[PDB]
Structure formats: structure tokens, C-alpha cells
Design a protein around this ligand. Structure first.
Ligand SMILES: O=C(O)C1=CC(O)[C@H](O)[C@H](O[C@H]2[C@H](O)[C@H](O)[C@H](O[C@H]3[C@H](O)[C@H](O)[C@H](O[C@H]4[C@H](O)[C@H](O)[C@H](O)O[C@H]4C(=O)O)O[C@@H]3C(=O)O)O[C@H]2C(=O)O)O1
Length: 232
């Protein structure tokens, strides 16, 4: 059989959040020891693959189920996260294979979090629909209001995509297939300076209906880097 995703990808700085009844989380170490299930597996094309049904368990402050990685700077402490200053970059390649009845899933994020671990709004959501990825960047740190939309069209269900999400000094740069857009979020709302952040990647299903079906998203490559000095 294929190597489990964490015995292939280096997942030593991710934990996995699942859509089972209990919304089980799989630790970095357990991922590295080969955790795999119906929700999380290496497919025949080598992809780390995330499956979640619309009927799945959901986290405390979301109505939607996920099979999704959550960045862990410290694999044993989810309260260790990064800030608006410096350069913080996630790069991935992936594809969305199957959608729920709503036709929408979220395949990558930056989630906000308070210093003490308390939940906060997402800053960036990569929303996939058949034919369109919308890289949404939240305007208000307090979670009110709406998002700035960044549309990348022509990306079909089953198409391989290359993505980057980068924060440098409170500006978000969102890229699909070499097309980069930028949103100055700290410039818009200084309150973002008060929040911390972490990356997410996987399958956050924007459908919780009993008859909604399920979704599958895939990752072929994945990297996160944090730096205090970037070179030309
Ligand atoms: O624009 C929006 O606000 C956005 C659009 C959506 O369609 C969707 O509702 C989205 O959801 C956000 C929101 O912030 C929501 O509260 C939730 O946050 C999660 C978060 O991603 C993460 O999983 C967090 O994990 C916590 C939690 O205590 C878990 O039980 C576990 O122990 O891990 C913790 C940790 O690692 O910090 O849970 C949050 C939660 O639901 O409490 O999802 C957001 C998102 O995924 O974008 O809002």
C-alpha cells in the first residue's frame, strides 16, 4: 500500500482536524507515525487526500465539517502562533476532486486567533468552486463586515493548481498559478495587529445538509516558511 501522508509529507508542524462525531484531532506525532483513515489518505497519484461528509461533526464555532490540517509551530501547544510582522508563507499544489451539493469548499486558510487561544475570524479563505477560486481576505479583525474578493477563474474541478498565501508586514499576497493579488489588511484595520495567525490546508466543506454528500480535496506539495529576513 501507499505510504500514509505523514510518512511521506513532513507533517511535524501540522495537526489534523477531523469530521467524525467527536471532531477528533490527530497530533503531529501521530501523523508522523502513519495515521490514515477514510478522512485522510494517500491516493494512487500520491496526493495527501482529505475526504469529509456534509453530515460530519463540526468545531465549536463553525457550522461546517472539515478534514483539515492546522499549522502547529509547537506541536504540543496550539497557543503558539505567528504575528503580522515578518514574512509568513504557505505554498501548495493541489486539486479539488469532488464537491458537496453546495458546490463550495475551502482548501486553504489563514485563521486568526487570540494570544490566549480564543477563537477569532479567519483572515484568508481560499474558496473553491468548479471554475473559480476566490481568495477572500477579511477586512475587519472583529469579524464583522465582509471580505475583499480575489477571483481566479478557469480552474475546473480536477485541475491541478499552484497556490501561495503570504503575509508580509500585515499585507496579504494571494497567488494562484503565478497570478498574485495583494490586500493591505493591517492598513485597513490596525486591530489585526492584536491577533495571531496560523495556516490551514485541506478540506473545509461549505455544506452541512443531511443530503449534501461529501467532498474531496488533494495536496501534492506543501510548505510553510517563516522568516525575519527575506532575500531578493
Ligand atoms: O468569514 C468567515 O468568518 C468564515 C467563513 C466561513 O464559511 C466559516 O464559517 C469560517 O469559519 C472560521 C471561524 O473562525 C470559525 O470559528 C472556525 O474556527 C475554527 C478554526 O479553524 C480551528 O479549527 C479552531 O480549532 C480550535 C478548536 O478549539 C478545536 O476544538 C481544536 O481543539 O483546535 C483548536 C485550535 O487548534 O485552535 O476551531 C475554530 C472553532 O470552530 O472554534 O472556522 C474558521 C475557519 O476555518 O475559517 O468563517
Amino acid at each position: 500500500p501507499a505510504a500514509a501522508p505523514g510518512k511521506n509529507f513532513d507533517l511535524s508542524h501540522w495537526k489534523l482536524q477531523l469530521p467524525d462525531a467527536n471532531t477528533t484531532e490527530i497530533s503531529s506525532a501521530n501523523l508522523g507515525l502513519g495515521y490514515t483513515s477514510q478522512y485522510f489518505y494517500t491516493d494512487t497519484d500520491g496526493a495527501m487526500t482529505f475526504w469529509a461528509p456534509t453530515t460530519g461533526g463540526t468545531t465549536a464555532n463553525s457550522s461546517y465539517p472539515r478534514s483539515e490540517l492546522r499549522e502547529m509551530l509547537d506541536p504540543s501547544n496550539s497557543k503558539v502562533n505567528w504575528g503580522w510582522q515578518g514574512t509568513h508563507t504557505m505554498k501548495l499544489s493541489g486539486k479539488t476532486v469532488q464537491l458537496p451539493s453546495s458546490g463550495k469548499i475551502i482548501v486553504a486558510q489563514i485563521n486568526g486567533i487570540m494570544d490566549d487561544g480564543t477563537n477569532a475570524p479567519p483572515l484568508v479563505k481560499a474558496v473553491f468552486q468548479d471554475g473559480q477560486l476566490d481568495m477572500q481576505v477579511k477586512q475587519n479583525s472583529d469579524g464583522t463586515g465582509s471580505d475583499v474578493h480575489n477571483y481566479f477563474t478557469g480552474i475546473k474541478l480536477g485541475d491541478l493548481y499552484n497556490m501561495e498565501i503570504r503575509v508580509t508586514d500585515g499585507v496579504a499576497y494571494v497567488t494562484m498559478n503565478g497570478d498574485t493579488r495583494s490586500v493591505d489588511f493591517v492598513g485597513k484595520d490596525a486591530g489585526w495587529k492584536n491577533l495571531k495567525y496560523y495556516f490551514k490546508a485541506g478540506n473545509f466543506v461549505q455544506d452541512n445538509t443531511s443530503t449534501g454528500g461529501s467532498a474531496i480535496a488533494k495536496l501534492y506539495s506543501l510548505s510553510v516558511s517563516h522568516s525575519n529576513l527575506e532575500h531578493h
